[PDB]
Design a protein around this ligand. Sequence first.
Ligand SMILES: CCc1nc2ccc(OC)cc2nc1O[C@@H]1C[C@@H](C(=O)N[C@]2(C(=O)NS(=O)(=O)C3CC3)C[C@H]2CC)N(C(=O)[C@@H](NC(=O)OC(C)(C)C)C(C)(C)C)C1
Ligand SMILES: [Zn+2]
Length: 187
Amino acid sequence: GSVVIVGRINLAYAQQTRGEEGCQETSQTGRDKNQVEGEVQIVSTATQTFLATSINGVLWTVYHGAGTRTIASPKGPVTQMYTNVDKDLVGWQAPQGSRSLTPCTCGSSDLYLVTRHADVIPVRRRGDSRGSLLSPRPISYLKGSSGGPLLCPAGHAVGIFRTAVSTRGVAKAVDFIPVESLETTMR
Ligand SMILES: CCc1nc2ccc(OC)cc2nc1O[C@@H]1C[C@@H](C(=O)N[C@]2(C(=O)NS(=O)(=O)C3CC3)C[C@H]2CC)N(C(=O)[C@@H](NC(=O)OC(C)(C)C)C(C)(C)C)C1
Ligand SMILES: [Zn+2]
């Protein structure tokens, strides 16, 4: 079926636009004539819910979430533009009404992760695709936030939340797809 937009996060505050009946319906129809807004979208399949983030006019998220699914749009289902499984990466054309995040070039190592509750979580950049959490978190607290953005102090995109780095059920750090690798994927 289709990936369906069921909410959005404005930059922070989250909003929901669609429920289980609507989501079950639109996952199946692929037709979503709903207004789109925001930089991060809350997105659902029939089984999973996570985040997706618009960068370079492309809406990016994780493959472990999206698979090869099409996305629901006002004119019908839209196929993926990018599918790079070894990056756990998929991308569709950013739907009308989304605004893309601007890539970070300030080189800051003080990052801020946005969760599906529109909570903003401090990260210390530890390297290209790695960030350590200042306060470690339970895995289930961060479940549903993959595909969501890591920002710099200025509000620029540093990457897309992919995997959590866990010891004994506690996330001590985050793995993210950097904005440069999206560039690489696009070319
Ligand atoms: C290798 C990644 C992967 N690839 C897949 C490819 C195909 C596939 O087929 C189905 C499944 C895959 N699963 C995958 O991983 C799965 C999915 C993914 C996941 O849950 N991602 C997030 C998250 O919030 N995810 S999410 O809940 O939003 C999900 C709905 C999208 C961001 C996490 C929130 C806590 N996973 C990890 O993050 C694991 N961490 C981890 O693997 O770290 C390593 C890479 C350093 C070892 C956990 C569970 C320990 C936290 C395991
Ligand atoms: Zn920046």
